[PDB]
Design a protein around this nucleic acid. Sequence first.
RNA 1: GAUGGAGGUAGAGCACUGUUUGGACUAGUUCAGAUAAACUCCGAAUGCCAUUCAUUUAUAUCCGGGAGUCAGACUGCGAGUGAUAAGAUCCGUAGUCGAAAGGGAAACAGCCCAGACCACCAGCUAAGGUCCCAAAAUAUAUGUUAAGUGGAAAAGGAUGUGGGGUUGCACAGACAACUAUCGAGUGACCCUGCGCCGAAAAUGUACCGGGGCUAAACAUAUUACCGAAGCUGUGGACUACACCAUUA
RNA 2: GGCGGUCGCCUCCUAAAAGGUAACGGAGGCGCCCAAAGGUUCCCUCAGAAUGGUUGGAAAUCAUUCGAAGAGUGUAAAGGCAGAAGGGAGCUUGACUGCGAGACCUACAAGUCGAGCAGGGACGAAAGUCGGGCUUAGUGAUCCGGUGGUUCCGCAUGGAAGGGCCAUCGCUCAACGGAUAAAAGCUACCCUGGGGAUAACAGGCUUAUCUCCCCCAAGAGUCCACAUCGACGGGGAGGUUUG
RNA 3: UGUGGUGGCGAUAGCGAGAAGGAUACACCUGUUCCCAUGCCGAACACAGAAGUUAAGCUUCUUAGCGCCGAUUGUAGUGAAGGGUUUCCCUUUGUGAGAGUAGGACGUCGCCACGC
Lengths: 58, 76, 141
Amino acid sequence: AELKITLKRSVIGRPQNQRATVKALGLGKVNSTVTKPANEAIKGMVNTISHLVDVEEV
Amino acid sequence: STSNGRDSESKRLGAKSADGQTVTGGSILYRQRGTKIYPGVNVGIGGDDTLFAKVDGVVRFERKGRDKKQVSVYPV
Amino acid sequence: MLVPKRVKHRREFRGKMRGEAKGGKEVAFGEWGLQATESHWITNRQIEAARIAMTRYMKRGGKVWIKIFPHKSYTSKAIGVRMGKGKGAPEGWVSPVKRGKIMFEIAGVPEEVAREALRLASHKLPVKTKIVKREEMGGES
RNA sequence: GAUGGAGGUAGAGCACUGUUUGGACUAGUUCAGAUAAACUCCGAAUGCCAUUCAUUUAUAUCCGGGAGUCAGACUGCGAGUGAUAAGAUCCGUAGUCGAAAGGGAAACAGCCCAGACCACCAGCUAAGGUCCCAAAAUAUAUGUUAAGUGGAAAAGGAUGUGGGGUUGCACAGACAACUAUCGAGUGACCCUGCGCCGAAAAUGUACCGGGGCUAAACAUAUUACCGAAGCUGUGGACUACACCAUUA
RNA sequence: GGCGGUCGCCUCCUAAAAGGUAACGGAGGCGCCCAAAGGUUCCCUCAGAAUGGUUGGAAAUCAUUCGAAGAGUGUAAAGGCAGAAGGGAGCUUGACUGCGAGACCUACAAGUCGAGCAGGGACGAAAGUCGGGCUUAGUGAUCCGGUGGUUCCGCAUGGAAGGGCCAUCGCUCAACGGAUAAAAGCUACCCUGGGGAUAACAGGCUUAUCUCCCCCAAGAGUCCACAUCGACGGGGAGGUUUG
RNA sequence: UGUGGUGGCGAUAGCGAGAAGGAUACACCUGUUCCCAUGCCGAACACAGAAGUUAAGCUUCUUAGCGCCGAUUGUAGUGAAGGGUUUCCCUUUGUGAGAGUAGGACGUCGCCACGC
């Protein structure tokens, strides 16, 4: 259905596709959140970013 | 004091259009030495083995029997 | 010293061992083996030194199988010469050995002579080793 | 993300070309076993090219005015030259520095965390830490080490200690000791945690930052707290865009 | 820095499975050749081995049976090729003229492939194939000059002299994107501007080498490996030596 | 149905061993006058035929010795994310071979002609 996605780490020191994935979701600064639908594409973005992010099934 | 040290310019060989891409008449599909790939429906061979379209359509890389490959172009 | 007759290329690259033996990790022709537990280069002179030591101890012969061959050459430059021009001249032959490889085999002689001979061969070599026998298959005599 | 595709690398293999060990044999082919950068019967992960495709997001292309740059450096990773030496040299790929302040690493361009519009004698965390210097646990349970190991170094050597296995000989009497008895055990092997020797340089201890430590060390778990110019709280400045009724 | 080598172009490895990618890194070729070794129509199938046979031998030339390629492909190597691009025979000159939708490569200038249209042809009964050769090296801007063509211009007019346009020729301009038509040395006798962008002592990093310390132990030591010495081999420390 | 012809599909379609068969058809076989031919040869190719025969090709059927098509689960490698000395090695998460095997397999789909 939906997922709350909060940014817990920084993007300094990471490669470019991970930066651009954080941008494609609409996450700006540390501890800013976002809510998205549950898809197979959004889950792929979350799986690319998992080490930087917390996710809660909402 | 070595007697090596020379090379020739790279030639940019390979595939120049993709599977499933639409293409206009005359566009190059593949640059090679000898027939690694063969010409198929609506495709020609040049003087130095380059493969080209004759007609506008989609590109499809296929298998020619047991051990060879083919390119064809199919109009809509 | 073992030397390959007739190489195809005079110089070559060196790397990149990254240990784990690809080939003979079991005893094939003898009763007892000498298995390397580290990975290193092994030269002509080290093999001949080990072989001479191993055979001298076995009065009444027996048999010995050398299962490691130096295929790859060295090169080196000389003292007093600045960096720069092409590779040096080849000086030596070596075989890369990776951990797991059995390197010698002995038969026709009871345990203690075989064990002493394999003990004397290992002090001539730059690797850590174990001693192994033929263990268990459909047929091992 | 899904679908199709081009291509011979990391494997590993010996059908082809080089290199190679044993055995049977005979003309007077065979059975096994290896190996490769310019070998291949085979062959990934990833990257790359597409699509009237999907979900989020805000860029991309075209014309014109003005530039600056053409000495880079270190650190992962993968290759060559070198001796698989160099804070060496030359390429590929990612980051930081350059042009980046703030916390940690004693001091430290490039490592670890994190990007400073401004005010506060407010709060929560990151990396890293909590006996004193110096903010926070002389935390909790169970073990190991005696060497100041922790807090520089190898081949090899040894009845140092913890744990798990395989067995020879034992009250129809064991090993050791005593001549010519004794009244419990005694040898020999394997893998494994942590320690010991091997260990000698020039102004003064002199790689724990110091004091000092038998835990304030090491292993496995568990919960509190400290900790930044990161995030939050209250207020102010400037910009954009949506709202709004003209008043912006 | 000098001395030595190299300077354009082609093929492979390096090169990390698209394309691209350095080094005074590892290996080789080119500066042409063919009037058929080009086009087209018919037809054909290789290298070896074994068996016999007079000279004739291992091996010239005959016959049979196995033989997916272990041969050939003008020339280097890679990729291709036995529905041949390999090998024979007949006829021929398409090794044509005007061109060109669209692609590839690419800083520029250049380089590469091209279906199809028109004129007039070769081979073949046709269908058809043919704008050199299995593919990729065999080449050099512009200025200036020579030869042939021309329904172009021509300083009052008609001519001429001279020029333009089209086709072709003259390069080891090889330092091969080519300075000028034309070019070598000495300075301890020296001068100015820059650079620790660059060489020498000392420092730093590294330890091949060097000095020292060891492990194993064949042996020597009358006997006896270890009183003393220690072959073939293996592992470290030091920062005084040559680098 | 049987046989002749001509086609698709990766040899799971092939190779070797073995059997059988002449109804039409297919072949071998017989000849060189005439169209054509041999770098010698009517061997081949070309033509005229129809005595002879299923021996060879061909067709059908049996056979898993050689080839071919091969899973599963285990390893080797390797995207991401981390840790020791950093020559090399290790732990999570995702992907996953080449070998080696269980099995498959002695074809399958279609048009025309003639005969039963």
